């Protein structure tokens, strides 16, 4: 139930690869991460 | 101390004994409201016959 | 047969006996005793035979202490079994002793009875033995 | 669990991160049931550089203003001794109340920290 998770919504694009337990967290994981293209912190969401 | 969590209507009430003429005043959470509260064998042989 | 009621490990490495016994070499609990003069593994059968001898002597009088306890498990391979493939079958427990260690103690009997009974016990043991008495003992009464 | 040991554990925790040198001395504070004491300490030498207290200082009746006066006094004493940078030591007290006023007043004075 643990799987790869991709965070997206950069600006190319900004991606972060993490892990999560989908049964424990069914809902989409969204976190604020640094965006290298815009040089600021933006909200990334799981695709 | 924590306002709201503690029970409200903590009025002063009087406990009155109806059969002891005793009146007390406290702050029981229940111009004081009044609560009424209520609060051998040889001898037998000699008595029968003697 | 003396052996521990429970044990943490079933098998034990065959260690090495090195010098003289620095503990249990003095007569405490009794008046007469026998000390080993060799280094050996004493088995429960030998201990029980010696105790039976020393108790059949002395009649019912006196008290006998055995001061060693077998708590070292040993194994034997078995006939037709080659070397290797792990430890063999368990074959009881032994007590390792070094010279100076007192094995048997007696109290409450005269000098001659004690000497004879401990001689009888020592004749059933696999080690040469020395008979000893407490140094503050009075020869008479 | 005595309040003394309760504060001693917190004192050890705070000293686990805060230590004072000749530059950036430790500003330690003692509260007590009345008055308030402030000390400037160089820990590598075990030597106090400056001090201030409210024992001979009295202007109001409320400990918050008295603590503010002590903070102003210790800022003055430190700037006279040649101290501009410090590190504050809670000394086992929660940073709120009289000690907060003392530290705020020391900020209004010199002692850029």
């Amino acid at each position: 139930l643990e799987c790869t998770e991709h965070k997206e919504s950069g600006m190319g694009i900004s991606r972060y690869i993490t892990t999560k337990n989908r049964k424990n967290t069914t809902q989409r994981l969204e976190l604020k991460k640094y965006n290298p293209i815009l040089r600021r912190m933006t909200l990334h969401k799981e695709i | 101390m924590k306002k709201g969590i503690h029970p409200e209507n903590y009025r002063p009430v009087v406990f009155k004994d109806m059969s002891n003429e005793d009146i007390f005043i406290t702050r029981s959470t229940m111009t004081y409201p009044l609560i009424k509260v209520e609060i051998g064998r040889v001898d037998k042989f000699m008595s029968r016959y003697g | 047969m003396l052996q521990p009621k429970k044990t943490k490990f079933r098998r034990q490495q065959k260690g090495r006996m090195k010098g003289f016994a620095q503990r249990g070499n003095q007569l405490s609990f009794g008046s007469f005793g026998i000390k080993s003069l060799q280094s050996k593994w004493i088995t429960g059968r030998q201990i029980e035979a010696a105790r039976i001898a020393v108790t059949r002597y002395m009649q019912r009088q006196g008290q006998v202490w055995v001061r060693i306890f077998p708590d070292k498990p040993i194994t034997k391979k078995g006939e037709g079994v080659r070397m290797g493939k792990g430890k063999g079958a368990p074959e009881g427990f032994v007590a390792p002793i070094t010279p100076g260690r007192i094995i048997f103690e007696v109290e409450g009997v005269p000098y001659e009875i004690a000497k004879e009974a401990l001689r009888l016990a020592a004749q059933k043991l696999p080690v040469t033995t020395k008979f000893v008495v407490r140094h503050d003992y009075d020869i008479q009464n | 669990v005595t309040k003394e040991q309760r504060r001693q554990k917190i004192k050890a925790r705070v000293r686990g991160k805060i230590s004072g040198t000749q530059e950036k001395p430790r500003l330690t504070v003692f509260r007590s049931n009345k008055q308030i004491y402030a000390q400037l300490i160089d820990d590598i030498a075990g030597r106090t550089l400056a001090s201030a207290s409210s024992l001979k200082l009295e202007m109001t009746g409320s400990k918050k203003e008295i603590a503010a006066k002590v903070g102003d006094e210790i800022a003055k004493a430190a700037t006279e001794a040649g101290i501009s940078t410090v590190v504050f030591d809670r000394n086992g007290y929660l940073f709120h109340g009289r000690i907060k006023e003392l530290a705020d007043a020391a900020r209004k004075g010199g002692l850029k920290f």
Binding site: - | - | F20, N25, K35, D136, D138 | -
Partner: protein, 128 residues
């Protein structure tokens, strides 16, 4: 209740010196207790008869050749593990004050009596 003993002074220490002493049938002994530093000396196996003995013979008067004379009691004895021979003796010097605790033989409810030399506080011996 008074043994007499004399001691040859001892100034060599170590396993070699002790072996040399014991080869000629003698025992290294030390004496300590109270004020003053300890005294090292040599006694003889024949000279010690308070060891292989029934009673607690207090008041060993020791005359050490290099030293004065003292009144002590037996404090510690070391035996060989195999031969049961005496290899070292340590004496505790008893004074007027500072009572010393020792073991006194018991007869049936009796004792041997410790009032002089040693002060008091005798524990027991063979309490069976």
């Amino acid at each position: 209740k008074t043994f007499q003993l004399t001691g040859t002074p001892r100034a060599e220490f170590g396993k070699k010196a002790a072996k040399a002493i014991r080869k000629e049938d003698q025992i290294p002994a030390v004496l300590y207790g109270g004020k003053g530093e300890g005294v090292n000396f040599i006694v003889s196996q024949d000279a010690v008869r308070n060891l292989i003995y029934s009673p607690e013979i207090f008041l060993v008067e020791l005359t050490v050749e290099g030293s004065g004379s003292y009144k002590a009691i037996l404090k510690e004895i070391q035996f060989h593990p195999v031969t049961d021979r005496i290899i070292h003796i340590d004496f505790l010097q008893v004074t007027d004050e500072k009572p010393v605790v020792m073991e006194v033989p018991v007869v049936l409810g009796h004792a041997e009596g410790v009032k002089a030399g040693g002060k008091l506080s005798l524990e027991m011996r063979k309490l069976k």
